[PDB]
């Protein structure tokens, strides 16, 4: 059969605007043919780590639906996106299960997500009282009470829960912006709509 309904990976990898790590965008990929070879054609990847599956055998497995999570982080925080990792991003921004079945793709974006005067449009939650559950997103922006008195707006002991990265081109690698895409493969009881190319 002729290959039809290619899964739109370019809308996720070649997107102009990437979401923040606290409001990571989840795109549902279902009912399409997934050619995992066109991934290397978008941009030179810096990291390609597949967990639970083999990257070369991805074209042979059929799945029901695939979820693509995209966000921006710094270079030092790309180590936190992994099953069973600690850190401010891995605990309070985006956490993966211990039985995660998928691949994480990361690449440096210092040429796009960095401004000469500082790109303060990307926010991250520094700390929360309870750690996030796997695949949980916290978008609430209520003022965090660091002291022992109830808060009434921004102050000395009050804190806005979201902090900006401030990416600058002169920053060394590690503080430069990195765009990360996380793929989750789901095997439910429904018919597997996402299959690989058949030749």
């Amino acid at each position: 059969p002729n290959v039809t309904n290619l899964c739109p990976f370019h809308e996720v990898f070649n997107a102009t605007r990437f979401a923040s790590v606290y409001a990571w965008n989840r795109t549902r990929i279902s009912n399409c043919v997934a050619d995992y070879s066109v991934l290397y054609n978008f941009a030179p990847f810096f990291a390609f780590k597949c967990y639970g599956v083999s990257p070369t055998k991805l074209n042979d497995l059929c799945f029901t639906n695939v979820y693509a999570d995209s966000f921006v982080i710094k270079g030092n925080e790309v180590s936190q996106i992994a099953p069973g990792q600690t850190g401010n991003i891995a605990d309070y921004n985006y956490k993966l299960p211990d039985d995660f079945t998928g691949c994480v793709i990361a690449w440096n974006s210092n040429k796009l997500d960095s401004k000469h005067s500082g790109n303060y449009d990307y926010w991250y939650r520094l700390f929360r009282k309870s750690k996030l559950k796997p695949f949980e997103r916290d978008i609430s922006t209520e003022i965090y009470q660091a002291g022992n008195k109830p808060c009434k707006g921004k102050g000395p002991n009050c804190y806005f829960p979201l902090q900006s990265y401030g990416f600058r081109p002169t920053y060394g690698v590690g503080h430069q912006p990195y765009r990360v895409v996380v793929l989750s493969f789901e095997l439910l009881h429904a018919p597997a709509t996402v299959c690989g190319p058949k030749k």
Partner: single-chain antibody
Framework: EIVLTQSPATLSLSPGERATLSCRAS??????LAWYQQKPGQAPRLLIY???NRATGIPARFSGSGSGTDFTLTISSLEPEDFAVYYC??????????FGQGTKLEIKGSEVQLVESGGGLVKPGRSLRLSCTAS????????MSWFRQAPGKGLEWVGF??????????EYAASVKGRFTISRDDSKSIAYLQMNSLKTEDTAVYYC????????????????????????????WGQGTTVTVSS
């Protein structure tokens, strides 16, 4: 907008006597009250914060009390060298500080360091840039504030630069808006104050002070009265620079 008035202007007490200082709050600066001690020729030293908590390093004789529209500083010991000026600072408006007029108390009747450069005789219509070099702490996770003290007058806040985590924006007092510019350079841990279109009213000693710790994940597990909270969250004052402007 909030006006702080200190009732005793000059208090004359012999060593060994009890001193009581008052501070009226136009409106309620509930528990947002600080007390500073400034000896002649030195930077103000923080004594009481939150109107009740003493600074780590001051004797137990300095008792801070009051909550609401009335505040009281109590010194009830031998009082051997408490000869200085005590100021009443409120922080309801977090960026905008307002000080009291000051109370004169006559006697008869670490590596965390801020060094400031620049500041000299300058013509009125000229410009001058000050610098505030930090040391001993992580510059970038803190905000920086600028204060000035006219010769013989009280303290007033000049500007405020936010940390990189919260946009790094600047706020100024109504008297310095459009004339003064505050910059930040985290790579070399230095803060700048670009003063333009000066006037004779700008003759003062300018100070730079450390402000709110942006890393609140550390401040959560710290008690407000503990020594770690004061070391991480509270203020650090540096030796000021005299800026003289005249014909």
């Amino acid at each position: 907008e909030i006006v702080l008035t200190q009732s005793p202007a000059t208090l004359s007490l012999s060593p060994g006597e009890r001193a009581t200082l008052s501070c009226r709050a136009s409106q309620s600066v509930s528990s947002y009250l600080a007390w500073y001690q400034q000896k002649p020729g030195q930077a103000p030293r923080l004594l009481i914060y939150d109107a009740s908590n003493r600074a780590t390093g001051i004797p137990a004789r300095f008792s801070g009390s009051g909550s609401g529209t009335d505040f009281t500083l109590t010194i009830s010991s031998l009082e051997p060298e408490d000869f200085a000026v005590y100021y009443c600072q409120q922080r309801s408006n977090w960026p905008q500080y307002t000080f009291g007029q000051g109370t004169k108390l006559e006697i008869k009747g670490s590596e965390v360091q801020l060094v400031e450069s620049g500041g000299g005789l300058v013509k009125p219509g000229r410009s001058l840039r000050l610098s505030c070099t930090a040391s001993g702490f992580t510059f970038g996770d803190y905000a920086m504030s600028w204060f000035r003290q006219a010769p013989g007058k009280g303290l007033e806040w000049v500007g405020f630069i936010r940390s990189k985590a919260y946009g790094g924006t600047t706020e100024y007092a109504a008297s310095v808006k459009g004339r003064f510019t505050i910059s930040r350079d985290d790579s070399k841990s230095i803060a700048y104050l670009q003063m333009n279109s000066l006037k004779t009213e700008d003759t003062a000693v300018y100070y730079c002070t450390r402000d709110r710790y942006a890393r609140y994940d550390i401040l959560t597990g710290l008690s407000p009265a503990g020594a770690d909270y004061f070391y991480y969250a509270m203020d650090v004052w540096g030796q000021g620079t005299t800026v003289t402007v005249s014909s």
